[PDB]
Ligand binder design. Sequence first.
Ligand code: HEM
Ligand SMILES: CC1=C(/C=C/C(C)=C/C=C/C(C)=C/C=C/C=C(C)/C=C/C=C(C)/C=C/C2=C(C)CCCC2(C)C)C(C)(C)CCC1
Ligand SMILES: CC1=C(/C=C/C(C)=C/C=C/C(C)=C/C=C/C=C(C)/C=C/C=C(C)/C=C/C2=C(C)CCCC2(C)C)C(C)(C)CCC1
Ligand SMILES: [Cl-]
Ligand SMILES: [Cl-]
Lengths: 453, 37, 338, 34, 30, 333, 48, 131
Amino acid sequence: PGYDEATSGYAWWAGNARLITPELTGRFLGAHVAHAGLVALWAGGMLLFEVSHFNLSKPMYEQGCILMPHIATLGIGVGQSGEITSMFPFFAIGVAHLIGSAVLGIGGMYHAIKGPEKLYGFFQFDWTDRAKVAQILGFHIAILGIFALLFAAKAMYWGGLYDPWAPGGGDVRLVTNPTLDPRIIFGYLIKRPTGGEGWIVSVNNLEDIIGGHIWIGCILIAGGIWHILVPPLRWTYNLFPWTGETYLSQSLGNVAGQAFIAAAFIWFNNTAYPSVFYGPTVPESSQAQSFVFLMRDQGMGADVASAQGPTGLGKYLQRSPTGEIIFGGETMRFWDARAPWLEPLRGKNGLDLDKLQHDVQPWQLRRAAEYMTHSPIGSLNSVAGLATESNAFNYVSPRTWLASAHFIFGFFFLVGHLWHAGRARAAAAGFETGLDREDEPVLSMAPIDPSLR
Amino acid sequence: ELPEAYRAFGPLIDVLPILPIFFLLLAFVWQASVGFR
Amino acid sequence: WIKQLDDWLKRDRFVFIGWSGLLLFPCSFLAIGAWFTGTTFVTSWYTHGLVSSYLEGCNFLTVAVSTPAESMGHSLLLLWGPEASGDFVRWCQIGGLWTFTALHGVFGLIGFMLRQIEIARLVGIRPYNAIAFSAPIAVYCATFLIYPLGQSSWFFGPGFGVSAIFRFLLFFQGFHNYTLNPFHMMGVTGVLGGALLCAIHGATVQNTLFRDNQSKNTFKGFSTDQGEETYSMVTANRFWSQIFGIAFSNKRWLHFFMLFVPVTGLWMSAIGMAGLAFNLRAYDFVSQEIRAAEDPEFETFYTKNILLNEGLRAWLSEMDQPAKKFVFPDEVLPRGFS
Amino acid sequence: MVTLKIVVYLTVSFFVGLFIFGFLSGDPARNPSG
Amino acid sequence: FTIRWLAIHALAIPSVFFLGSIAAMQFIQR
Amino acid sequence: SQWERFCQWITSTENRLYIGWFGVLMLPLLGVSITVFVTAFIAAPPVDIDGIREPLSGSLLYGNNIITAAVVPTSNAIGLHFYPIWEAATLDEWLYNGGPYQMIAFHYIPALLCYLGREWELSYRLGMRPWICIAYSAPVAATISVFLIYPIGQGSFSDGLPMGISGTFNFMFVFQAEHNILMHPFHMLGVAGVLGGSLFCAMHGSLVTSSLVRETSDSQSQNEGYKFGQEEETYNILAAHGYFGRLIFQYASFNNSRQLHFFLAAWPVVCIWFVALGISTMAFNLNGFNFNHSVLDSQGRVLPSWADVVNRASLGFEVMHERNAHNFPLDLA
Amino acid sequence: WIIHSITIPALFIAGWLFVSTGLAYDAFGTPRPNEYYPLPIVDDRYNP
Amino acid sequence: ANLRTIPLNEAGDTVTLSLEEFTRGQQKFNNACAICHLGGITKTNPNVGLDTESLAGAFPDRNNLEGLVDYLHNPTTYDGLTEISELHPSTKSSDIYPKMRNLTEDDLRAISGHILLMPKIRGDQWGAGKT
Ligand code: HEM
Ligand SMILES: CC1=C(/C=C/C(C)=C/C=C/C(C)=C/C=C/C=C(C)/C=C/C=C(C)/C=C/C2=C(C)CCCC2(C)C)C(C)(C)CCC1
Ligand SMILES: CC1=C(/C=C/C(C)=C/C=C/C(C)=C/C=C/C=C(C)/C=C/C=C(C)/C=C/C2=C(C)CCCC2(C)C)C(C)(C)CCC1
Ligand SMILES: [Cl-]
Ligand SMILES: [Cl-]
């Protein structure tokens, strides 16, 4: 068969490339179902690991958890101000994942050890059979859309999501009125990716989040039905080779960009990633420092707005390049941060002095007292306090870990996409194994030097 | 901490996250067993 | 009689000995060995006021065979010498293992260059590898020998450990402003270009290969015995001419360039260290130290490097050299107004 | 600077349109083999 | 007692000793 | 068709410099980058780098040096805001706030992405294997980590790499003070990669040079023994192999050359990937190893180690950078 | 696995017991965990 | 030895601490208090350090083990005007700060005894840091 190097062309270290060939489709399916099982295996076991070492005293983000916050964001297990009501829902999801891993592992072992080596009936696909591969694409788009709509329905009907912007603190609440405006939802796509706008990372309420999910669920149902019913058109014939490595390369490039986007979401956004669960963003932690050094100087009689720094700028409060009242110091770079413990200090011009001096509603100090001294700063062996500081504190933020890991994943997958894009083009062309000695293309080209005729 | 009713696994729950990091190792193990044929 | 031993040493075994192996294997085995003895067991408490062994509690990053005590001067610190009087422990507490390791290492490096020459002579190839190895020896002699000889003692040499080298790097910036040293800038250029050349030549060869096999694994498209080029130099010249504007056309010149670039970079950095032995430093630009002092508004990145150097100097030196007993009160230490 | 913003918008538009429509000109057929 | 028996032991008769020492250092209470 | 003539001319392998569709994007991006950089490196006025009305004089006509000139990074007052030529009031606050840096950077980063794509383009038009762009992706990752990813992670384009020699040195020192990159394992890999790539470059060059086939006389260059396009191998792989094997041991010297040049590609490329990634995770403040206060005596006193001495020098750098700009004791990102 | 059955053990245990019995601290003059602060940089050459 | 012996109260009675008890208190210093008291000072306010000269000069004198435990029972100012148990973690106020909800009287005693049985070990290495 095609399981060694000699009858496949692929060495041991490039051996899953032996599943490229379209007669080995049962093994392609087996490798995939077993990999999906491994993904669910980690999803179960790592969550159970987080639960088994969870101390209820420390909130959630000091524990070094990354799957606990994802569940808590969905309004499961937690209630008011993100307090863990019960440790049983996290355990239930951690075991439901294990059972799914078991079932998917059995399927992956079946189609790789015992099931039919070549698929048939309505499951036989060839990579060059473009109507069939688009039809499989369409089923995947339709199933993805019905998951996105089901998530939106759950956010709207059953239970709810954690709203960090809910009145006071932020409780779980079900989104009754999602933003169905095409002007608003697709206006996120035209916002500049730069500071101030933050292209889609600045989605900052649950109506916009769930309305965009309703839209994309419908859009994906539509595109899935389109690909089941309409084969690839004539204009998409010579755009790129229709091989399997091409399809992989395109997936790789899109998901590399998607990992970069998720790194931005975990690092800047505090709506879909509530800081009760993931800890404060660096912008929000750095405004929390200024807010607590502000409230120190209230009470000991230091009028803030007439206070100069080393440079004549505002010692605690100054004006933006736009001219809005922002926190002074180096934290003037994060004047675009919008944390919900600070929005009731926001007026018309930014931080007005009216509901700043005889404001802060007690918890708003406490919360910002918490986020001041839990900043995303740390090391590989888990320590905090700048970097040139004494090691006593054993802590590195979840947001640091997730953003670092997904920039890493985005970078390797952009590299892997470039690898498979070049290789797919070269393999379809017929020169991915080297130059033909019999005829070399540069030998049949005219010279580039202008003097040479 | 995990629920007391199912607080018998102990080190099992420690093992399960690094269970998938052993599958990539056992891939190299199987390839050595066949001899990287 | 004497010819028999020559015929012995030139034999074909698992490890070639040669005549150079008398000046290489007894020294290198000692130098390498004295590092492992040092970084496992001996302390720098009496030379440096720090812990630098696995027995202390350090790890691989923070173990060292630290430099001798600053009061030892430029003494060789022989075991039978007056500073140890034959006593092994008193020789290890004063940093005699650093001098053992450094002297056995420079002799090992001489022995290895002699080995490269001897094996080239035996096989019959040109001795270009020994020429290229003259650049690590120029750097070793500049950093570990010429620099501490020009300084006060062996103490200011680089310690034989990872973090000791990191201290050496930051010491050289703060006290020497070594990034500003142009010979070091050519060293950096040579080393970065050597890495660029290594990467670009490997990838160019790998992507201009000929179809000399049938399998997708192109690593089996080359035999040792074949006398033909495995990659198209013509296609590579075409590609780099139309990408970069220039390309190599001469394979021999290409591989001489790959020799020439990191070796000359490394030699130029050794010249810079030879200058830093006598404190002859590219520390400052006199025009800008002047202008920034007649104008309290003239800020360049250079003036912010000079300030950072002063900050490093005052905030390191009281525990860097503890023989000097530098006492700096907290209010003469340059802070940047925390 | 509104006119300069327009010039930049059109210049970026023109160059990216050249890129995009040039990669819908049957670019994989621009190989030496075929 | 040959050349093969010395160039594999002068590097390794000490090395196992060193490794045993360093493995004992993981159990030192300081 | 005029358009088909255009697509033939762009994708033409007849041009002295290949253009292609990545090059039709690359050439204007370089035009802007080169124009604004040569303009700003010579004649830009001082830039308010840290947003505190302390202009930093970075250009060659403002009393400044080739070593010490820099296109100074964009003001900390701007942060990550899009600040083009037209969103500023005038052409003098834009110069004052560091707009030239952002313009050069925002054309330089896509120009390098397009140069990588152009390398793939020409590999495809010449029928050679397509992965020189993969090798080039390592310095590109490195230069995007210090021009885009670290400013994004830290929150301002003032934390970007200054476009100058001494500005680069300043970036290195401040980065060590704030992140301890020397004790970052990705940076130890990057150092191993650059120093070992130099080792392997010198090593491979000396071996191929040392085992050259005699074709020439002694009073002419050995490079005349090679003829461009000759099919015969110009050196002896067997002789260089035998020398290297006698130098260390038997199963050490690459017999194969395709594997050998894959290793020459792979070692510095992979290590520069890792060190670009290290800059990028320190962009999210995931700093290097920390061994301060790690070796304690019987009572509990900290015995200094060499990492403590490196900390003490990093603290030296730490309390002097951006002096008139930290109003609180905690310099966050 | 015959002539080295105990040879590898005896040597490994020798290194282990060299550290564990405290002979290493006396062998190299290494300060024990409480000899650090009962700090002595040696200030003279011929008599440390 | 004598490092274990610390001031207990303001009456004057040097109470000795077990080494294991001191270590147990030291650990709990680095889990609920090193968030912002790591090193010897307070991150929220860089003037109220956990040093001997500061705690003896506190009003009331809080350089005592019972004094520190009673502080943890009631957060006040450095002169003791307003008992602001809300800006600070507090043994009574577990709702604002859940870090000491599991800490017993022995835990408070040990963490308060470890703060006052470093300063003659370190000196100028805990007070405000080694510069
Ligand atoms: C069990 C944990 C803690 C203990 C034992 C503790 C102990 C103390 C003590 C004894 C004081 C008064 C010292 C003085 O001012 O002289 C104090 C003050 C202070 N503590 Fe802590 N603390 C703990 C937790 C924290 C934490 C987690 C924070 C982080 C927000 C914090 C912030 C402060 C601040 C800002 C002050 C000065 C307030 C004032 O002047 O009243 N404390 N702490
Ligand atoms: C949910 C959500 C949301 C929403 C979102 C949305 C609504 C979206 C969308 C979106 C879309 C709707 C998209 C898209 C895309 C696109 C793509 C992905 C593309 C492409 C393409 C390509 C890449 C192509 C390429 C090419 C070329 C150009 C060359 C030739 C060949 C080809 C064709 C291949 C929001 C944020 C609001 C809120 C929150 C959440
Ligand atoms: C035709 C065509 C082409 C070409 C293109 C090109 C060639 C381009 C370009 C371009 C360019 C070539 C551009 C440019 C530019 C520029 C600019 C945009 C400028 C600027 C500036 C500024 C802004 C300055 C400023 C300043 C400073 C910084 C200092 C002093 C003061 C002042 C103010 C003067 C091709 C073939 C591709 C194809 C398509 C078509
Ligand atoms: Cl600040
Ligand atoms: Cl600075």
